[PDB]
Structure 1
Amino acid sequence: NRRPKEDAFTQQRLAAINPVLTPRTVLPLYLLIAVVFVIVGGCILAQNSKVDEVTIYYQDCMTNATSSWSDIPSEHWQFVFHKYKTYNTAPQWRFVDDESDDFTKQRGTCQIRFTTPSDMKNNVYLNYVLEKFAANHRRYVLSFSEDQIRGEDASYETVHDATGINCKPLSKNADGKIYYPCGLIANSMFNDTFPLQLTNVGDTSNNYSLTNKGINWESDKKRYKKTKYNYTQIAPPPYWEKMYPDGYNETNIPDIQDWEEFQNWMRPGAFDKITKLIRINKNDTLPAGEYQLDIGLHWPVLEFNGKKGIYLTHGSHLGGRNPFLGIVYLIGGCICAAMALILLTFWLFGGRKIADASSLSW
């Protein structure tokens, strides 16, 4: 016979819950989600308020900082210390000129003396912050060679004519030696020479050491690989010509596997603020002290009125000080209780039988 197969799937008789949203099931569900999210919101804000951060903008250090120590204008620095809420002891900055640097747009050394009144714990992250540097335009974020990130001695057509991601405005120079970290992302790599320590101002042989190791993920060394170009095949990018004044020698070619500041730069920031790790110390903790950052100024930001800064923090597990997750778990927790309140009171002062509001039998 023809007789379709009867097996509770083809008969559309699968086992099923058929959920009916009575106020006996939904109003305690709101209160339960309201209870968790004021607790998760209370415990996120509590841990977030302990996140101490030092943000010092130094884009104006060639201009507004003298050769002497002057307090930075309060426009530039933001200090958050939860043990010291009314903390206003301003950081200092001075500018050593370096007339041999011959660049004059961003040269010299911005020495920055901040005073953290509370110690940061074991991981101490020195981040540089870039504001208004737009690393998220569509030509910018596609401009590199993935062959050359992967350590390949890639030809001209694989760095320039690669279909998604190519080094398109910056493939090769005038004499045809291709740029080894080609593309706009590698070219515009944030120079500024950050030190390998914080100099403890007012203490001898207790300089808080920093390191450029442990700066990217360890796993990017699977993707970032040592290059296979001869030194005859490659040139530095055009804005790296001051780092390598003579092109690439037999020994000066940067192994981008070890060079993590490149690897952090080559991850373009999603948004208009850009925070990239440049110096970490995973070994020791940073005491309550007055410390000094000598930044070799090489990265111009003022011609686009952008900011350029230092972000010295020990984050939380949620990363950084940001009140959003704590506030908005509270808001969603206070909203689920407010609407457990509105719907319960409307169910008492209205409310109906669960059997006959049907339009047919009126």
Structure 2
Amino acid sequence: NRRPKEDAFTQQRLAAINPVLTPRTVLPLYLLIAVVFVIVGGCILAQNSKVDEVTIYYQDCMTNATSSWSDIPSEHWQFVFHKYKTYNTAPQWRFVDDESDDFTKQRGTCQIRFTTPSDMKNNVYLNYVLEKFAANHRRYVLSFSEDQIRGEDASYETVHDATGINCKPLSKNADGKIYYPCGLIANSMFNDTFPLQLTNVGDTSNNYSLTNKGINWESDKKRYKKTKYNYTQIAPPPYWEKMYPDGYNETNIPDIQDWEEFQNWMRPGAFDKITKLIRINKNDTLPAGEYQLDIGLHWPVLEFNGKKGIYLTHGSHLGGRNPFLGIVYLIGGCICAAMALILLTFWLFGGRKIADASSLSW
């Protein structure tokens, strides 16, 4: 028989619910989304108002600082403490010296002394902020070698003309030596020397120790591996030529499986502001007191009017003190309560009966 198969699928008789949006269904749907997003938006802004932070910019420390403790002008520092909303004791810097044998564009330690009238609770993160540095251009973010990130002995014709991500401007110097971290990303790192202890001046000389371990994800040690080059076929990239002034010896090959400041830098940030984690202390509490960190300046920004900074915070569950994410639940709960009163004032002063108003009969 050529009769087709009647199986409630070819007959299009699947089980369905057929929703009709009458104003006894979607008017409770609007006051339900309203009483969720207003209450969640109150529970985010109660959390995201208790987050404290410290931001100090120090790009104008070589030029606009003296050799004595002078207060930072207010265009650089900003810090927010919730227990002390009116707090205006400004931090003070001290530029140590032009230490007289360097590259004379940024040099010398920039000592910065601030005051914290709170308790940065358990995980005290120390980032660094970088404004107006473009790490999201086209040729920049595509210049590294993934086989050298993974630690292989790639040839010249494996880092240069690979498809997609190759280190095209930076692959050899003059002498056949492949640059071992190749590309514009690894060549152009951040190399200020941050301290490993906030110097507890004034109070007791019991320091606050900051470690640089655990600074990145501990699952990054599967694509980052130590290399197997022969210390005679590699040379440092041309902006690393003040850290390895003779070249690579038998010992100074950088273990990029363990050197985790480099692992933060090799993910290029997406926008024109860059905050990368560089110091941490998961052990102790940062109590109230006047601290001092001393940054050794090495990385120049004033030839393109960029910024360098310090970002000392305990975080949150949603990140840091970004007040957007709790405002927009209040807006999404007030619009869903506005558009439920627009459609209930119009419905009473207005409205329909719910059958036989067709244009078919009209």
- Fold agreement, TM-score > 0.5: yes
CA distances 1:76-129 after superposition (whole Å, capped 9, x unpaired): 001100001111110111111243442111111111001011110110000000
2:120 partner SS: coil
Aligned residue number for residue 274 of structure 2: 274
1:114 partner SS: strand
2:185 partner SS: helix
CA distances 1:134-168 after superposition (whole Å, capped 9, x unpaired): 10001111111000110112111221111111111
1:273 deviation in Å? Answer: 0.7
Whether the 8 Å CA contact 1:83–1:118 is kept in 2: the answer is yes
CA distances 1:175-204 after superposition (whole Å, capped 9, x unpaired): 121111111111111111111111111134
1:189 partner SS: coil
Whether the 8 Å CA contact 2:203–2:289 is kept in 1: the answer is no
1:68 deviation in Å? Answer: 0.4
Whether the 8 Å CA contact 1:121–1:314 is kept in 2: the answer is yes
Matches within 5 A, 1:326-341: 326-341=326-341
Whether the 8 Å CA contact 1:195–1:293 is kept in 2: the answer is yes
TM-score, normalised via structure 2 length: 0.98
Whether the 8 Å CA contact 1:128–1:310 is kept in 2: the answer is yes
TM-score, normalised via structure 1 length: 0.98
1:3 deviation in Å? Answer: 1.9
Whether the 8 Å CA contact 1:101–1:107 is kept in 2: the answer is no
Whether the 8 Å CA contact 2:129–2:309 is kept in 1: the answer is yes
- Give structure 2 stretches of 5+ with no counterpart: none
1:205 deviation in Å? Answer: 4.0
What is the rounded CA distance, in whole Å, between the counterparts of 1:101 and 1:35 in structure 2?
Answer: 65
Greater helix content: 1
CA distances 1:269-298 after superposition (whole Å, capped 9, x unpaired): 111110000001111111111111111101
What is the rounded CA distance, in whole Å, between the counterparts of 2:205 and 2:112 in structure 1?
Answer: 19
Whether the 8 Å CA contact 2:199–2:205 is kept in 1: the answer is no
- Give structure 1 stretches of 5+ with no counterpart: none
Whether the 8 Å CA contact 1:123–1:282 is kept in 2: the answer is yes
1:357 deviation in Å? Answer: 2.5
What is the rounded CA distance, in whole Å, between the counterparts of 2:30 and 2:17 in structure 1?
Answer: 20
What is the rounded CA distance, in whole Å, between the counterparts of 2:127 and 2:250 in structure 1?
Answer: 32
Aligned Cα RMSD in Å?
1.0
Aligned residue number for residue 192 of structure 1: 192
What is the rounded CA distance, in whole Å, between the counterparts of 2:294 and 2:3 in structure 1?
Answer: 86
1:2 deviation in Å? Answer: 2.0
What is the rounded CA distance, in whole Å, between the counterparts of 1:288 and 1:250 in structure 2?
Answer: 46
After TM superposition, what 4+ stretches of structure 1 lie above 4 angstroms from structure 2?
Answer: none
CA distances 1:183-239 after superposition (whole Å, capped 9, x unpaired): 111111111111111111113441101111011100001111001111111111111
2:121 partner SS: coil
What is the rounded CA distance, in whole Å, between the counterparts of 1:8 and 1:114 in structure 2?
Answer: 75
Whether the 8 Å CA contact 1:135–1:269 is kept in 2: the answer is yes
CA distances 1:42-91 after superposition (whole Å, capped 9, x unpaired): 11111111111100000000011111010001000011000011111101
1:32 deviation in Å? Answer: 0.7
What is the rounded CA distance, in whole Å, between the counterparts of 1:357 and 1:336 in structure 2?
Answer: 29
Whether the 8 Å CA contact 1:226–1:257 is kept in 2: the answer is yes
Whether the 8 Å CA contact 1:111–1:295 is kept in 2: the answer is yes
What is the rounded CA distance, in whole Å, between the counterparts of 1:73 and 1:176 in structure 2?
Answer: 50
CA distances 1:16-52 after superposition (whole Å, capped 9, x unpaired): 1111111111111111111111111111111111111
What is the rounded CA distance, in whole Å, between the counterparts of 2:274 and 2:217 in structure 1?
Answer: 17
> How many pairs are equivalent?
362
What is the rounded CA distance, in whole Å, between the counterparts of 1:87 and 1:162 in structure 2?
Answer: 55
What is the rounded CA distance, in whole Å, between the counterparts of 2:97 and 2:18 in structure 1?
Answer: 76
What is the rounded CA distance, in whole Å, between the counterparts of 2:234 and 2:9 in structure 1?
Answer: 65
What is the rounded CA distance, in whole Å, between the counterparts of 1:143 and 1:101 in structure 2?
Answer: 33
